[PDB]
Amino acid sequence: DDIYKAAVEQLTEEQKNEFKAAFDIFVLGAEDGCISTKELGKVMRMLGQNPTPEELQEMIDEVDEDGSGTVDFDEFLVMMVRCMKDDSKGKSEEELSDLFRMFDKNADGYIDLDELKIMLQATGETITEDDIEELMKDGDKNNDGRIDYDEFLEFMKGVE
């Protein structure tokens, strides 16, 4: 729901305006002027294909962080760059063990916030405690305050 914004950060803006016009025809004949089910449907139809309104409304909700339920034009551009091949490859358990022995400098089987903090400060990017905090919390689904190893798989599942 955000990685698409991260990818357009990597992509250009000419694609954004091409999708502006896209959205415009994606609602050519719309009921709501945004992409509901049938709007995305006529998108696929102009694409030469015929979709079902369920997955339509779902890709509508596949970005839905707040529960917005619809395709805002912003959320629209999100959904349209969702389909460009920008960042792939779904990082997971093996290299995550290789990296978790490090990320668990405490070797708990669980990344305490100590290691995550230090390695973020090492990341070179600006390090907020919103960073380290959200990262601890998303890792730690048991919410132990420490990112378990499989909670670390969660922590680095796919994030290219």
Partner: peptide, 12 residues
């Protein structure tokens, strides 16, 4: 976007 735009899908 190519099946949509043809020539106009240049970056698309």
């Amino acid at each position: 976007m190519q099946a949509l735009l043809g020539a106009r899908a240049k970056e698309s």
